[PDB]
Amino acid sequence: KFDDDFYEFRSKIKELERRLASVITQGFDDYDTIYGRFKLLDNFEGLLT
Protein backbone atom coordinates (compact mmCIF):
# COMPACT_ATOMS: atom_id res chain seq x y z
CA LYS A 1 0.00 0.00 0.00
CA PHE A 2 2.97 2.38 0.84
CA ASP A 3 4.56 1.68 -2.63
CA ASP A 4 1.24 2.93 -4.22
CA ASP A 5 1.24 5.98 -1.82
CA PHE A 6 4.91 6.73 -2.87
CA TYR A 7 3.97 6.71 -6.65
CA GLU A 8 1.09 9.19 -5.87
CA PHE A 9 3.46 11.46 -3.80
CA ARG A 10 6.34 11.12 -6.40
CA SER A 11 3.92 12.33 -9.19
CA LYS A 12 2.81 15.36 -7.03
CA ILE A 13 6.56 16.20 -6.41
CA LYS A 14 7.40 15.90 -10.19
CA GLU A 15 4.48 18.39 -10.84
CA LEU A 16 5.83 20.64 -7.98
CA GLU A 17 9.51 20.50 -9.26
CA ARG A 18 8.27 21.65 -12.76
CA ARG A 19 6.46 24.69 -11.17
CA LEU A 20 9.70 25.57 -9.22
CA ALA A 21 11.81 25.32 -12.47
CA SER A 22 9.28 27.71 -14.20
CA VAL A 23 9.41 30.22 -11.23
CA ILE A 24 13.30 30.17 -11.24
CA THR A 25 13.35 30.87 -15.08
CA GLN A 26 10.92 33.86 -14.65
CA GLY A 27 13.01 35.25 -11.71
CA PHE A 28 16.27 34.87 -13.76
CA ASP A 29 14.72 36.67 -16.84
CA ASP A 30 14.09 39.69 -14.48
CA TYR A 31 17.19 40.87 -12.46
CA ASP A 32 19.20 41.35 -15.76
CA THR A 33 22.55 41.74 -13.84
CA ILE A 34 25.31 39.02 -13.44
CA TYR A 35 25.30 40.02 -9.68
CA GLY A 36 21.47 39.92 -9.15
CA ARG A 37 21.28 36.51 -10.95
CA PHE A 38 24.24 34.99 -8.96
CA LYS A 39 22.43 36.20 -5.74
CA LEU A 40 19.21 34.35 -6.85
CA LEU A 41 21.15 31.02 -7.31
CA ASP A 42 22.69 31.37 -3.77
CA ASN A 43 19.09 31.50 -2.28
CA PHE A 44 18.20 28.13 -3.98
CA GLU A 45 21.79 26.65 -3.57
CA GLY A 46 20.44 24.39 -0.74
CA LEU A 47 17.05 24.07 -2.62
CA LEU A 48 18.38 22.22 -5.76
CA THR A 49 16.08 19.13 -6.28
Binding site: K39, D42, N43, E45, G46
Partner: protein, 50 residues
Protein backbone atom coordinates in the same frame (compact mmCIF):
# COMPACT_ATOMS: atom_id res chain seq x y z
CA UNK B 1 20.70 36.15 1.96
CA UNK B 2 22.82 36.65 5.17
CA UNK B 3 21.15 33.61 6.93
CA UNK B 4 21.92 31.43 3.79
CA UNK B 5 25.52 32.88 3.60
CA UNK B 6 25.90 31.93 7.34
CA UNK B 7 24.55 28.37 6.53
CA UNK B 8 27.25 28.02 3.76
CA UNK B 9 29.97 28.97 6.36
CA UNK B 10 28.44 26.47 8.91
CA UNK B 11 28.09 23.85 6.05
CA UNK B 12 31.87 24.11 5.15
CA UNK B 13 32.66 23.41 8.88
CA UNK B 14 29.99 20.62 9.40
CA UNK B 15 31.64 18.82 6.36
CA UNK B 16 35.36 19.45 7.31
CA UNK B 17 35.16 20.55 11.06
CA UNK B 18 33.90 17.18 12.50
CA UNK B 19 35.87 15.38 9.66
CA UNK B 20 38.84 13.30 11.03
CA UNK B 21 41.70 11.69 8.97
CA UNK B 22 41.54 7.81 8.95
CA UNK B 23 37.90 6.92 9.96
CA UNK B 24 36.87 3.82 7.86
CA UNK B 25 40.22 2.02 8.70
CA UNK B 26 39.61 2.43 12.51
CA UNK B 27 36.02 0.99 12.15
CA UNK B 28 37.50 -2.05 10.23
CA UNK B 29 40.11 -2.57 13.07
CA UNK B 30 37.23 -2.45 15.68
CA UNK B 31 35.30 -5.06 13.53
CA UNK B 32 38.47 -7.33 13.40
CA UNK B 33 38.79 -7.39 17.27
CA UNK B 34 35.03 -8.33 17.56
CA UNK B 35 35.52 -11.11 14.86
CA UNK B 36 38.48 -12.58 16.91
CA UNK B 37 36.39 -12.36 20.17
CA UNK B 38 33.43 -14.22 18.49
CA UNK B 39 35.94 -16.82 17.08
CA UNK B 40 37.26 -17.39 20.68
CA UNK B 41 33.63 -17.61 22.06
CA UNK B 42 32.56 -20.32 19.47
CA UNK B 43 35.78 -22.31 20.36
CA UNK B 44 34.75 -22.03 24.10
CA UNK B 45 31.17 -23.15 23.10
CA UNK B 46 32.80 -26.08 21.15
CA UNK B 47 34.92 -27.01 24.27
CA UNK B 48 31.75 -27.06 26.55
CA UNK B 49 29.82 -29.84 24.67
CA UNK B 50 33.23 -31.59 23.92
Amino acid sequence: LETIKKQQELAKRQVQKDMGSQKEKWEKKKLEMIETAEASFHENLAKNPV
